[PDB]
A paper describes a structure:
Oxygen activation in all heme enzymes requires the formation of high oxidation states of iron, usually referred to as ferryl heme. Ferryl heme refers broadly to a highly oxidized form of the heme in which the iron is in an oxidation state that is either one equivalent (FeIV, known as Compound II) or two equivalents (formally FeV, known as Compound I) above the resting oxidation state (FeIII). Here, we report 1.06 Å and 1.50 Å crystal structures for Compound II intermediates in cytochrome c peroxidase (CcP) and [name] (APX), collected using the X‐ray free electron laser at SACLA. The results indicate that the ferryl species is finely tuned across Compound I and Compound II species in closely related peroxidase enzymes.
In a set of parallel experiments, single crystals of Compound II in APX were prepared by reaction with m‐chloroperbenzoic acid, as previously. In this structure (unlike CcP above), the resolution is not high enough to see hydrogen atoms. An electron density map of the distal heme region is shown in Figure 4 B. In this structure, the iron‐oxygen bond length is 1.87 Å (with an error estimate from SHELX of 0.046 Å), and the ESU of the iron and oxygen positions are 0.014 and 0.083 Å respectively. Positive nuclear density has identified an FeIV‐OH species for Compound II in APX, which is in agreement with the longer bond. In the other position (“out”), Arg38 moves away from the ferryl group, and exchanges with a water molecule. This movement of the distal Arg residue is not evident in CcP.
Author numbering: 2 to 249
């Protein structure tokens, strides 16, 4: 159950103006995938049992940026700082999650509902909570299930965020896009994953894990066949992720 906090009218006005400015900025800079990854890596540190981590603005801290999993996200933070400065009333936590919602929207994805009121927290979570691309389904459930508190459906739908963007050998070490159209939010991640490896496209071991797991594979098949079902389940999961630890 979520009970969202009240924010002032002025705060609500700034969310709306920031949403529009983020559309223009993220479209022009071609940085939707990185902005989605910043929001995801922000939220994905939540541990439900201790209620630590999650989307509370800490990823901008040099000490969280310096986590190995977060290679390259300093770029994201830097790119957003001038625009954030235009919206002093907004928390960083809300601004980065709004950026992730807008990243999905401006690449043609679902409209993920957005609620303001996240407070910036003073201290980043311990390093080590983000998923490891070399591991498989048990590990995915450890991180998205046992720590974050998301469902198996959420795991597969959120994995579809790889439909935009690419890996970089100087960041993670992996290299290349998952899809032929890495600035378009669609179900291609799943149709690629099914079709086997393609010259010039990437699959992580963690993506492949989806194919061999009895619960994940029917969802991959669903999303490959029905982009609308993918969009519905993605929007549900992204909203949940963006709200972990918030408004509970
Ligand atoms: C399931 C487990 C996860 C693993 C192991 C994983 C791993 C990775 C890796 C290794 C990269 C490449 C980083 C680089 O070299 O630039 C990456 C990027 C990406 N990830 Fe994930 N990922 C996972 C889940 C997610 C989720 C939950 C989403 C958000 C819904 C997400 C969104 C993205 C985006 C959009 C990119 C591309 C970034 C860019 O183009 O710079 N990933 N991920
Ligand atoms: K795509």
């Amino acid at each position: 159950g979520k009970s969202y906090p009240t924010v002032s009218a002025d705060y609500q006005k700034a969310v709306e103006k920031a949403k529009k400015k983020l559309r223009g900025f993220i479209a022009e800079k071609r940085c939707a995938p990185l902005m989605l990854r910043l929001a995801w890596h922000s939220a994905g540190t939540f541990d439900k049992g201790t209620k630590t981590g999650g989307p509370f603005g800490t990823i901008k801290h040099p000490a969280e940026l310096a986590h190995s999993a977060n290679n390259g996200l300093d770029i994201a933070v830097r790119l957003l700082e001038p625009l954030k400065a235009e919206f002093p009333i907004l928390s960083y936590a809300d601004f980065y999650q709004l950026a992730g919602v807008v990243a999905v929207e401006v690449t043609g994805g679902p409209e993920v509902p957005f609620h303001p009121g996240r407070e910036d927290k003073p201290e980043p979570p311990p390093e080590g909570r983000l998923p490891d691309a070399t591991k498989g389904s048990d590990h995915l459930r450890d991180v998205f299930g046992k720590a974050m508190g998301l469902t198996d459906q959420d795991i597969v739908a959120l994995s579809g965020g790889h439909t935009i963007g690419a890996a970089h050998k100087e960041r993670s070490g992996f290299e290349g896009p998952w899809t032929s159209n890495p600035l378009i939010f669609d179900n291609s991640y799943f149709t690629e994953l099914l079709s086997g490896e393609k010259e010039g496209l990437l699959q992580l071991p963690s993506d492949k894990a989806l194919l061999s797991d009895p619960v994940f594979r029917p969802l991959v098949d669903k999303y490959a066949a029905d982009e609308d079902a993918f969009f519905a389940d993605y929007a549900e999961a992204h909203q949940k992720l963006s709200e972990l630890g918030f408004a509970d």
